[PDB]
Enzyme design. Structure first.
Site, PDB file in Angstrom:
ATOM      1  N   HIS A  65       0.830  -1.191   0.000  1.00  0.00           N
ATOM      2  CA  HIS A  65       0.000   0.000   0.000  1.00  0.00           C
ATOM      3  C   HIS A  65       0.869   1.247   0.000  1.00  0.00           C
ATOM      4  O   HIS A  65       1.931   1.335   0.613  1.00  0.00           O
ATOM      5  CB  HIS A  65      -0.877  -0.015   1.258  1.00  0.00           C
ATOM      6  CG  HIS A  65      -1.657   1.197   1.514  1.00  0.00           C
ATOM      7  ND1 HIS A  65      -2.606   1.740   0.662  1.00  0.00           N
ATOM      8  CD2 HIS A  65      -1.699   2.002   2.595  1.00  0.00           C
ATOM      9  CE1 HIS A  65      -3.176   2.800   1.227  1.00  0.00           C
ATOM     10  NE2 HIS A  65      -2.664   3.005   2.405  1.00  0.00           N
ATOM     11  N   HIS A  67       0.741   4.686   1.179  1.00  0.00           N
ATOM     12  CA  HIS A  67      -0.032   5.318   2.229  1.00  0.00           C
ATOM     13  C   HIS A  67      -0.246   6.779   1.996  1.00  0.00           C
ATOM     14  O   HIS A  67       0.701   7.549   1.976  1.00  0.00           O
ATOM     15  CB  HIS A  67       0.670   5.073   3.584  1.00  0.00           C
ATOM     16  CG  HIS A  67      -0.057   5.666   4.727  1.00  0.00           C
ATOM     17  ND1 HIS A  67      -0.592   4.902   5.775  1.00  0.00           N
ATOM     18  CD2 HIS A  67      -0.349   6.992   4.960  1.00  0.00           C
ATOM     19  CE1 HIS A  67      -1.191   5.813   6.584  1.00  0.00           C
ATOM     20  NE2 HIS A  67      -1.061   7.050   6.113  1.00  0.00           N
ATOM     21  N   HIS A 110       4.182   0.444   2.504  1.00  0.00           N
ATOM     22  CA  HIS A 110       4.330  -0.652   3.464  1.00  0.00           C
ATOM     23  C   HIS A 110       3.543  -1.837   3.029  1.00  0.00           C
ATOM     24  O   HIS A 110       2.520  -1.739   2.340  1.00  0.00           O
ATOM     25  CB  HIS A 110       3.934  -0.185   4.893  1.00  0.00           C
ATOM     26  CG  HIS A 110       2.530   0.320   5.049  1.00  0.00           C
ATOM     27  ND1 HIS A 110       1.441  -0.495   5.202  1.00  0.00           N
ATOM     28  CD2 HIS A 110       2.068   1.600   5.166  1.00  0.00           C
ATOM     29  CE1 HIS A 110       0.375   0.275   5.438  1.00  0.00           C
ATOM     30  NE2 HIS A 110       0.706   1.574   5.424  1.00  0.00           N
ATOM     31  N   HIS A 112       0.766  -4.491   3.281  1.00  0.00           N
ATOM     32  CA  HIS A 112      -0.601  -4.407   3.802  1.00  0.00           C
ATOM     33  C   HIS A 112      -1.233  -5.802   3.794  1.00  0.00           C
ATOM     34  O   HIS A 112      -2.428  -5.956   3.508  1.00  0.00           O
ATOM     35  CB  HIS A 112      -1.430  -3.361   3.043  1.00  0.00           C
ATOM     36  CG  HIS A 112      -2.429  -2.667   3.876  1.00  0.00           C
ATOM     37  ND1 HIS A 112      -3.319  -3.285   4.728  1.00  0.00           N
ATOM     38  CD2 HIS A 112      -2.704  -1.327   4.002  1.00  0.00           C
ATOM     39  CE1 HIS A 112      -4.044  -2.352   5.348  1.00  0.00           C
ATOM     40  NE2 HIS A 112      -3.709  -1.143   4.939  1.00  0.00           N
ATOM     41  N   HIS A 397      -5.251   5.365  19.849  1.00  0.00           N
ATOM     42  CA  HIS A 397      -5.339   4.694  18.549  1.00  0.00           C
ATOM     43  C   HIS A 397      -5.260   5.692  17.411  1.00  0.00           C
ATOM     44  O   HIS A 397      -6.106   6.586  17.310  1.00  0.00           O
ATOM     45  CB  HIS A 397      -6.642   3.935  18.433  1.00  0.00           C
ATOM     46  CG  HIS A 397      -6.833   2.907  19.496  1.00  0.00           C
ATOM     47  ND1 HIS A 397      -6.171   1.689  19.470  1.00  0.00           N
ATOM     48  CD2 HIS A 397      -7.632   2.926  20.592  1.00  0.00           C
ATOM     49  CE1 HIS A 397      -6.559   1.046  20.564  1.00  0.00           C
ATOM     50  NE2 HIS A 397      -7.416   1.753  21.246  1.00  0.00           N
ATOM     51  N   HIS A 400      -6.780   5.724  10.497  1.00  0.00           N
ATOM     52  CA  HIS A 400      -6.379   6.116   9.139  1.00  0.00           C
ATOM     53  C   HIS A 400      -7.451   5.672   8.165  1.00  0.00           C
ATOM     54  O   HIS A 400      -8.001   4.576   8.270  1.00  0.00           O
ATOM     55  CB  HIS A 400      -5.053   5.441   8.812  1.00  0.00           C
ATOM     56  CG  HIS A 400      -4.663   5.527   7.371  1.00  0.00           C
ATOM     57  ND1 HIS A 400      -4.490   6.719   6.701  1.00  0.00           N
ATOM     58  CD2 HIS A 400      -4.412   4.566   6.456  1.00  0.00           C
ATOM     59  CE1 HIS A 400      -4.164   6.440   5.425  1.00  0.00           C
ATOM     60  NE2 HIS A 400      -4.090   5.130   5.235  1.00  0.00           N
ATOM     61  N   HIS A 402      -8.071   5.165   4.026  1.00  0.00           N
ATOM     62  CA  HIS A 402      -7.540   5.100   2.671  1.00  0.00           C
ATOM     63  C   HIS A 402      -8.397   5.986   1.716  1.00  0.00           C
ATOM     64  O   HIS A 402      -9.552   6.286   1.980  1.00  0.00           O
ATOM     65  CB  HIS A 402      -7.577   3.663   2.161  1.00  0.00           C
ATOM     66  CG  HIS A 402      -6.662   2.704   2.858  1.00  0.00           C
ATOM     67  ND1 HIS A 402      -6.042   1.719   2.134  1.00  0.00           N
ATOM     68  CD2 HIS A 402      -6.249   2.520   4.132  1.00  0.00           C
ATOM     69  CE1 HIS A 402      -5.332   0.978   2.963  1.00  0.00           C
ATOM     70  NE2 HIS A 402      -5.396   1.439   4.194  1.00  0.00           N
ATOM     71  N   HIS A 452      -9.072   2.085   9.516  1.00  0.00           N
ATOM     72  CA  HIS A 452      -8.564   1.213  10.560  1.00  0.00           C
ATOM     73  C   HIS A 452      -7.609   1.907  11.460  1.00  0.00           C
ATOM     74  O   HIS A 452      -7.003   2.924  11.111  1.00  0.00           O
ATOM     75  CB  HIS A 452      -7.899  -0.041   9.912  1.00  0.00           C
ATOM     76  CG  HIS A 452      -6.695   0.251   9.076  1.00  0.00           C
ATOM     77  ND1 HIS A 452      -5.426   0.361   9.593  1.00  0.00           N
ATOM     78  CD2 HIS A 452      -6.569   0.439   7.745  1.00  0.00           C
ATOM     79  CE1 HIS A 452      -4.584   0.588   8.592  1.00  0.00           C
ATOM     80  NE2 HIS A 452      -5.238   0.651   7.442  1.00  0.00           N
ATOM     81  N   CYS A 453      -7.417   1.313  12.637  1.00  0.00           N
ATOM     82  CA  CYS A 453      -6.313   1.722  13.490  1.00  0.00           C
ATOM     83  C   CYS A 453      -5.006   1.328  12.842  1.00  0.00           C
ATOM     84  O   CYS A 453      -4.873   0.204  12.333  1.00  0.00           O
ATOM     85  CB  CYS A 453      -6.440   1.052  14.867  1.00  0.00           C
ATOM     86  SG  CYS A 453      -5.068   1.631  15.939  1.00  0.00           S
ATOM     87  N   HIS A 454      -4.017   2.221  12.844  1.00  0.00           N
ATOM     88  CA  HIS A 454      -2.730   1.964  12.208  1.00  0.00           C
ATOM     89  C   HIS A 454      -1.696   1.345  13.144  1.00  0.00           C
ATOM     90  O   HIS A 454      -0.565   1.135  12.730  1.00  0.00           O
ATOM     91  CB  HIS A 454      -2.173   3.228  11.524  1.00  0.00           C
ATOM     92  CG  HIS A 454      -1.472   2.912  10.227  1.00  0.00           C
ATOM     93  ND1 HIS A 454      -0.349   2.152  10.123  1.00  0.00           N
ATOM     94  CD2 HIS A 454      -1.753   3.259   8.953  1.00  0.00           C
ATOM     95  CE1 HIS A 454       0.013   2.071   8.843  1.00  0.00           C
ATOM     96  NE2 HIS A 454      -0.822   2.747   8.086  1.00  0.00           N
ATOM     97  N   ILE A 455      -2.077   0.994  14.374  1.00  0.00           N
ATOM     98  CA  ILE A 455      -1.272   0.069  15.179  1.00  0.00           C
ATOM     99  C   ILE A 455      -1.530  -1.295  14.547  1.00  0.00           C
ATOM    100  O   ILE A 455      -2.654  -1.820  14.594  1.00  0.00           O
ATOM    101  CB  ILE A 455      -1.640   0.166  16.666  1.00  0.00           C
ATOM    102  CG1 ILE A 455      -1.293   1.543  17.212  1.00  0.00           C
ATOM    103  CG2 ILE A 455      -0.955  -0.956  17.438  1.00  0.00           C
ATOM    104  CD1 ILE A 455      -1.891   1.864  18.582  1.00  0.00           C
ATOM    105  N   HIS A 458      -3.301  -4.083  16.203  1.00  0.00           N
ATOM    106  CA  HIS A 458      -4.719  -3.853  16.411  1.00  0.00           C
ATOM    107  C   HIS A 458      -5.527  -4.103  15.127  1.00  0.00           C
ATOM    108  O   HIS A 458      -6.617  -4.665  15.185  1.00  0.00           O
ATOM    109  CB  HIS A 458      -4.965  -2.423  16.913  1.00  0.00           C
ATOM    110  CG  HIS A 458      -4.334  -2.132  18.225  1.00  0.00           C
ATOM    111  ND1 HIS A 458      -4.415  -0.864  18.763  1.00  0.00           N
ATOM    112  CD2 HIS A 458      -3.653  -2.926  19.065  1.00  0.00           C
ATOM    113  CE1 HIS A 458      -3.766  -0.928  19.926  1.00  0.00           C
ATOM    114  NE2 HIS A 458      -3.301  -2.144  20.138  1.00  0.00           N
ATOM    115  N   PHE A 463      -9.457  -4.287  14.189  1.00  0.00           N
ATOM    116  CA  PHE A 463      -9.900  -2.889  14.411  1.00  0.00           C
ATOM    117  C   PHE A 463     -10.019  -2.127  13.083  1.00  0.00           C
ATOM    118  O   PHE A 463      -9.201  -1.251  12.776  1.00  0.00           O
ATOM    119  CB  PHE A 463      -8.995  -2.191  15.397  1.00  0.00           C
ATOM    120  CG  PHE A 463      -9.607  -1.145  16.296  1.00  0.00           C
ATOM    121  CD1 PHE A 463     -10.976  -0.980  16.455  1.00  0.00           C
ATOM    122  CD2 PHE A 463      -8.776  -0.362  17.072  1.00  0.00           C
ATOM    123  CE1 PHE A 463     -11.501  -0.088  17.388  1.00  0.00           C
ATOM    124  CE2 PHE A 463      -9.271   0.547  18.008  1.00  0.00           C
ATOM    125  CZ  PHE A 463     -10.613   0.658  18.180  1.00  0.00           C
TER     126      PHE A 463
HETATM  127 CU   LIG Z   1      -5.217   0.773  17.931  1.00  0.00          CU
HETATM  128 CU   LIG Z   2      -0.127   3.181   6.086  1.00  0.00          CU
HETATM  129 CU   LIG Z   3      -3.418   4.123   3.814  1.00  0.00          CU
HETATM  130 CU   LIG Z   4      -4.649   0.418   5.684  1.00  0.00          CU
END
Ligand SMILES: [Cu+2]
Ligand SMILES: [Cu+2]
Ligand SMILES: [Cu+2]
Ligand SMILES: [Cu+2]
Ligand SMILES: *[C@@H]1O[C@H](CO)[C@@H](O[C@@H]2O[C@H](CO)[C@@H](O)[C@H](O)[C@H]2NC(C)=O)[C@H](O)[C@H]1NC(C)=O
Ligand SMILES: *[C@@H]1O[C@H](CO)[C@@H](O[C@@H]2O[C@H](CO)[C@@H](O)[C@H](O)[C@H]2NC(C)=O)[C@H](O)[C@H]1NC(C)=O
Length: 497
Positions: A65, A67, A110, A112, A397, A400, A402, A452-455, A458, A463
């Site tokens: 992906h 980002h 990164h 995905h 948290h 993010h 897309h 989604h959460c980007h941790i 998670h 998440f």
């Molecule tokens: Cu999180």
């Molecule tokens: Cu990302």
């Molecule tokens: Cu993204």
């Molecule tokens: Cu994503």
């Protein structure tokens, strides 16, 4: 050197020792972090990704992906596994062929798929502006002014034991740093500046989890960009940067020639700087080659507060200036229990057929789309508001979206919304218990967009939801290449699905 906008990118396994501890990794371009992919605003990127992975302990499939890039008309190139594509299998390649109209700033790429980016597939992605309105604020902006912040783990991502707490073993700044335990005096990164010049430092969190308190002893930092969005100048002496966020800041090399500590304190893992953990070196040309002797203050004078940021351009806020003042006002119930996260009562588990392929095959309401309850339709050409009230364990948290950036109408730790001039960005901390961080955007980009959460731990634990934006126009808007159509048959054959 930077690569792109047209380039091959090989994904391989190799041993690395960025903190003195050797472990296998998943790498783009043979390095951690991966090489910078770069071009100019509006360029055609064609990143032909060659999956050469052979070690199943970190997964031999992959998907990448880009980002923060909106992918308008190219949703199939966005990268989230089982949302926009099936993964690329080993021994195969895939051309991510897209354009970046109307965007210029600091991004990253990164894996995905699963938690694979934690195992090393992460790198910067810069879209320069030949006519940047901020150009006169600095002298130098190049590969030497990118600063990546990364968490690094000795345990492999797939091998993190179910039921034990996950924390990192080192902070890596530009790919180097020291381990929190069994610390050895492995090399630290050096960022070199010349006295009297001004630098556009492009600060990129490539974190899988922690946020960092970033500072540079003796210096302050003038923010000019937030997640790709040009900002008014905001001078700070510390930046709390959450996973996946970016800032550009001007660094004025206006201190005596010397060595200064660069600090990146994660919110988990090793606390402090003993033995040179959580550290890099800012070295002026002509300084002695030796460690800094500087210290941080006890209390920072001008920490970044998100509500202080404002766009450079007159971006405003879509909709009406009150809660719920949007065409499609949403409030998500974000929860955690028993090892799984949920959104509106549903924990995300990736589907067998990617959401985009389900839509292209004719599934045209979101209630029809798998996973059931995880795909929410958005109407076209509409103002969307999404309130993201915090409280779920494991915070804060960083959420993010897309396909989009968004106005941050309400930020962490401040109950007052801003319907006038808040910053726009793509990844936002939803804060602490009782907060009501809220985002707004307009739907002008048909396709399924992950929220989604980007941790990453998670995300893996559920998440996430998918916004199926303008289902009716998704097929016409996003013509797909044959190579994309070939991905799921190849993947399903390889995996006996
Ligand atoms: Cu999180
Ligand atoms: Cu990302
Ligand atoms: Cu993204
Ligand atoms: Cu994503
Ligand atoms: C966050 O803000 C949203 C609105 O953006 C609040 O949503 C309202 O919630 C109440 C019940 O708590 C409902 O009666 C309303 O219909 C919702 N929408 C409105 C008023 O526009 C939400 O309560 C807020 N959450 C927190 C934790 O402060
Ligand atoms: C809490 O957030 C609000 C909203 O973003 C901030 O209020 C703004 O403050 C600026 C600076 O004084 C004023 O120009 C604006 O008119 C305010 N907007 C609103 C809607 O009130 C506020 O400063 C933040 N609080 C803190 C402590 O930073």
């Amino acid at each position: 050197a930077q690569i792109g906008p047209v380039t091959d990118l090989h994904i391989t396994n190799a041993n690395i020792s960025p903190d003195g501890f050797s472990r296998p990794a998943v790498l783009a371009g043979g390095t951690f972090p991966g090489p910078t992919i770069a071009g100019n605003t509006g360029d055609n990127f064609q990143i032909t990704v060659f999956n050469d992975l052979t070690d199943p302990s970190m997964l031999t499939d992959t998907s990448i992906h880009w980002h923060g890039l909106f992918q308008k008309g190219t949703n199939w190139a966005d990268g989230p596994a089982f949302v926009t594509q099936c993964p690329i299998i080993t021994g195969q390649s895939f051309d991510y062929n897209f354009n970046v109209p109307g965007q210029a700033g600091t991004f990253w790429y990164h894996s995905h798929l699963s938690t694979q980016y934690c195992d090393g597939l992460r790198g910067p992605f810069v879209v320069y502006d030949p006519n940047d309105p901020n150009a006169s604020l600095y002298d130098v902006d190049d590969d030497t002014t990118i600063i990546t912040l990364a968490d690094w783990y000795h345990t492999l991502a797939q091998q993190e034991p179910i039921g034990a707490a996950i924390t990192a073993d080192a902070t890596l700044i530009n790919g180097l740093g020291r381990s929190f335990t069994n610390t050895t005096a492995s090399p630290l990164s050096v960022i070199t500046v010349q006295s009297g010049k001004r630098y556009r430092m492009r600060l990129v969190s490539i974190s899988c989890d922690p946020n960092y308190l970033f500072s540079i002893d003796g210096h302050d930092m003038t923010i000019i960009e937030v997640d790709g969005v040009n900002s008014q100048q905001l001078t700070v002496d510390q930046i709390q940067i959450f996973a996946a966020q970016r800032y550009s800041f001007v660094l004025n090399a206006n201190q005596p020639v010397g060595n200064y500590w660069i600090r990146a304190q994660p919110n988990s893992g090793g606390q402090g700087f003993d033995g040179g953990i959580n550290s890099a070196i800012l070295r002026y040309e002509g300084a002695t080659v030796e460690d800094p002797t500087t210290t941080a203050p006890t209390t920072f004078s001008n920490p970044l507060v998100e509500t202080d940021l404002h766009p450079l351009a007159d971006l405003g806020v879509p909709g009406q200036p009150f809660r719920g003042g949007a065409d499609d006002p949403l409030v998500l119930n974000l929860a955690f229990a028993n090892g799984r996260f949920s959104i509106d009562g549903v924990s995300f588990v990736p589907p067998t057929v990617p959401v985009l392929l389900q839509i292209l095959s004719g599934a045209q309401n979101a209630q029809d789309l798998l996973p059931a309850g995880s795909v929410i339709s958005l109407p076209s050409n509409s103002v969307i508001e999404v309130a993201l009230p915090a409280g779920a364990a494991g915070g804060p948290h960083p959420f993010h979206l897309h396909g989009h950036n968004f106005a941050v109408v309400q930020s962490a730790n401040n109950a007052t919304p801003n319907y006038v001039n808040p910053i726009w960005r793509d990844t936002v901390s939803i804060g602490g218990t009782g907060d009501n961080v809220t985002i707004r955007f307009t739907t002008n980009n048909p396709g399924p967009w992950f929220l989604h959460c980007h941790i990453d731990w998670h995300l893996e634990a559920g998440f996430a939801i998918v916004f199926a934006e303008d289902i009716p126009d998704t097929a016409s808007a996003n013509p797909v290449p044959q190579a994309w159509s070939d991905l799921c048959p190849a993947y399903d054959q390889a995996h006996n699905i």
